[PDB]
């Protein structure tokens, strides 16, 4: 049960810091605090206050403030998204914020005792229920319509959280209910089988290339899928084909609609069985996803290095690629960006293939790499980068990336070859219904983050990758 | 733009609004056109949702919301016969005024005129008509303990005939919640409750509860997750002390094969309350496994991730290894708000002491340092490693072999970076003694190393007011003597001072009788050595406690 809801897109530079877009306060809950808090209760504010207390505690608004100790102190660590707001000389407690792609999400649950210890925050549901609220709404709201989307944003939620409780969090089910007008337990979020899985497996690995270091790939995957057939209860479970060559499934988690996860998957963190495939659902109005899974699989795909010896102002950044042979030869994009923290007014530059077109900030020459790598499988670029004045601040201020050490910020991309084996398979059909599976099947391959780690440079290294 | 203009200036603000010239007839004129037919449905629509949003700021005594809620009651049932769309709304308005308002009661008009046609609406846009109603019958009932008692049988009989299995589920646990423990405190059960009353404001049942459970559960497959978990979280309240938990234990254990965030924690406050009746010895050791995987699982946003981050480090014991040690310590590739919550697994797992613990909490403070003294970064980076040794220090007060390299680091770290003097101050301010000690010293050490000519003093002098004492004497004058000459700003002119009245806390007689002189004698701003003319005075001519008593 929350106390009111917010959406505030975010505004850089404005003094305000951005125009509220959703302001609903309930109040049967407001007199419901101050029956359960009683002495601890404390108020919530207006617009412009909590919008002000916000971006001042999200670090979002002026953070060039010298040292305020009520944010920035060493006494006062946030390890959670749940903050605790100050406005009007008492302490609000609790209200929930996050932000991605210049959108914030607000909420203040209700919490069914007195404030006078803190109670735990595993035990307050409204934490939880307003996190969830904010998160239906960011996807809904940048989905993929720059304002038919968040004009009816407020008569959307009206119908799914109408008086402090909410009753569904998919705020795409809010237009369907609204703008479209149930004698079974039909689920409360639905108002020919064709399914359109579009599995997505990007490659971040910190290669690095070091003895007792290992080198560090991790592949992550996901798979989105949607019954959306007719009939009463069709049963459509698909099954995915990796072949005895790659691993079982790795590093399986579900969807709030889907039904559990095998013991397996509980165990294998970081059954053992390419099949059969049994993935119980519900079918959804929604978009299930039976599964996340990061397959491993032990042959990395593209391997690399990088010498950049500062003789002065001769970044010669002998690179030097990779690539195994399990990958195709035909890159949509295979933009070896080589950004430049830290330091091309001369590209005196040696390219062994494909055009090292310095950008016009001259900060960064992007050597795009192209489309193919040649027969040599081997770039380099031997430029006497005569940087002109030291730019210490103009240039991208990457910390990850200090003196010698950086790596290759290779933007590569590949259509329907990644680095798992993923294969869905419709002829093993096995149902208690009948219908034609149309498993429109895909994949590709995204640099997540793929970072050549210079070997002749340190490294940041996670905790295993040391470890014997 | 009839009301437009009317309701800009109160949504601008409603109390400030409320409490001006116009705001005493807005009420009265807003119950006045309900009725009306020259207001479009536009008004009336908007007109019907403030009246939602605001009850407590029309009707605030009482009789007005009684009044009130008579006049919505009378303009819902005048209502032209045909399809409209203020069904719904003025319902739920004339509800949001009376529970708001305080005047709800089994003793007044408006109540008994309401809460008979919401219980006949709700029994049954017509659907969406018969959700508001039981939504608001249910939100009624949480107003008043009981209010909403009196249709538990027709629920009941009629789980299978029309009626939405959301509304109905949730205002019938809620209701089997408020009337047992009510009816159980009077000293009687049900009493045939499963089978409008006002008197609850002031063996079967057992078999009668299971069916009550278990057609719960069955109709909560349809349930949205977010209700799910509030329906769960109170069910997990209400059956721990009042069968066993067998029936629901299939549900549990399927919905923790999943990671969203309401069901996760619905499964977590069910095992901080019913405790350990059903967790397995073991089944402890599955939930952290995966709320530690989740607290770092690639396909789920930040938020979720550190709320499970959270969770973990607080997790419910049942009865009160290092792998799981090993799948969410703290890497320099995590962003700043998520190394904190995993930097007190990295001093539990070091507390007891594969390269050496203190040698990967080395290399990442270490890396933490080198970030912050980037000069030209932002603060986060700083405020990332303050936290870090804040919550190291409290965490390891007690093994010197593991601190002092951090001491040492964290001198280096001002040495190189200077800029970073509240955070220190703020440290030293909070750390506990056996931490505060030993790093007064080296960082005193650090300030007072440097003969006093570089343009850091105004950071310096900060350090040197928050640390000095009666230790290390003559290094301290020393340094201070050279600093005379490089303070021309009335900023440093008063952390220099704030220095000698740490002295004069501290309480040094000898030399100090020149030190605080000589500031007095050759400073800039006039201020500044009125400042230590008279703190000079005090420790010449005051007694050790009346110093502490008189200044």
Known sequence: ????????????????????????????????????????????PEDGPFLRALLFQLRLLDDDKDFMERRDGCSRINKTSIYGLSVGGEELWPVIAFLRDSMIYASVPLVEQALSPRP?????????????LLLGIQDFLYSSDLHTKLSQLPDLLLQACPLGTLLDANLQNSLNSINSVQPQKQPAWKVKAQISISITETVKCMQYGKQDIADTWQVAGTVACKCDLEGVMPAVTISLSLPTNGSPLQDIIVHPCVTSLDSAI?????????????????????????CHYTSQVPVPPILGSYHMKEEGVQLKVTVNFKLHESVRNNFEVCE??????????????????????????????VWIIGQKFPKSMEISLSGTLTFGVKGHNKQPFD?????????????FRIADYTLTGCYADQHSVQVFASGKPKISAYRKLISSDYYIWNSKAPAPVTYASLLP | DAWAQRLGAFRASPSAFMAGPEGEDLGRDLLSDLRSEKLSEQTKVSLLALSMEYPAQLWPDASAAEVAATSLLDTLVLLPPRPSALRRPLLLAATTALAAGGALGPTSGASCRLLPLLLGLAAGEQRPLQATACECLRELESCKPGLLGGSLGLLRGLLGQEGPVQPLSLLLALALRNTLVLQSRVGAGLGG??????????????????????????????????????????????????????????????????????????????????????????????????LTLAAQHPALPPPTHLFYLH??????????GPQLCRGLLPSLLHDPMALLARLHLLCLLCAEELPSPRHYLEELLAGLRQRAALDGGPRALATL??????????????????????????????????????????????VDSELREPLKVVLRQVVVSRPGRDEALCWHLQMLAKVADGDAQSATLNFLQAAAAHCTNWDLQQGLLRVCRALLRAGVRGGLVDLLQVLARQLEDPDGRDHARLYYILLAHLAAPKLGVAL
Request: net charge positive; hydrophobic share 45%.
């Open chain 1, 1 to 44: 049960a929350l106390r009111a809801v917010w959406l505030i897109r975010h505004e850089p530079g404005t003094p305000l810091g951005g125009t509220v877009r959703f302001s609903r306060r309930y109040p049967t809950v407001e007199k419901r605090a101050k029956a359960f808090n009683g002495m601890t209760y404390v108020p919530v």
């Open chain 2, 193 to 290: 409750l499963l089978t409008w009353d006002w008197t609850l404001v002031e063996p079967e049942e057992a078999r009668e509860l299971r069916a009550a459970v278990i057609q719960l559960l069955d109709t909560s497959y349809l349930l949205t997750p977010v209700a799910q978990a509030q329906l769960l979280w109170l069910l997990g309240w209400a059956l721990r002390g009042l069968q066993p938990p067998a029936l629901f234990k299939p549900q549990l254990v399927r919905l923790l094969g999943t990671a969203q965030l309401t069901l996760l924690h619905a499964m977590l406050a069910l095992k901080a309350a019913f405790g350990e009746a059903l967790f397995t010895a073991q089944d402890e050791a599955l939930l952290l496994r995966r």
């Open chain 2, 311 to 320: 969770c973990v480090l607080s997790f419910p014991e049942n009865w009160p």
């Open chain 1, 336 to 365: 070896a960006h080589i950004p430049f923290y830290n330091r091309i007014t001369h590209l005196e530059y040696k390219a062994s293939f494909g055009q090292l077109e310095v950008f016009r900030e001259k900060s960064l020459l």
């Open chain 2, 385 to 430: 490693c303050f936290q870090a040794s804040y919550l190291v220090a409290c965490c390891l007060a007690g093994q010197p072999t593991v601190l002092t390299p951090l001491i040492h680091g964290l001198a280096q770290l001002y040495q190189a970076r200077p800029m970073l003097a509240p955070h220190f101050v703020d440290l030293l301010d909070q």
């Open chain 1, 120 to 132: 735990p925050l595993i035990s307050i549901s409204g934490v939880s229920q307003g996190l969830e």
């Open chain 1, 266 to 290: 509980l165990t294998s963190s970081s059954s053992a069985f390419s099949g059969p495939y049994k993935f119980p659902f519900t079918p959804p109005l929604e978009s299930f996803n039976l």
């Open chain 1, 399 to 411: 910390h990850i990336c200090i003196g010698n050490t950086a790596y290759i910020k290779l933007n």
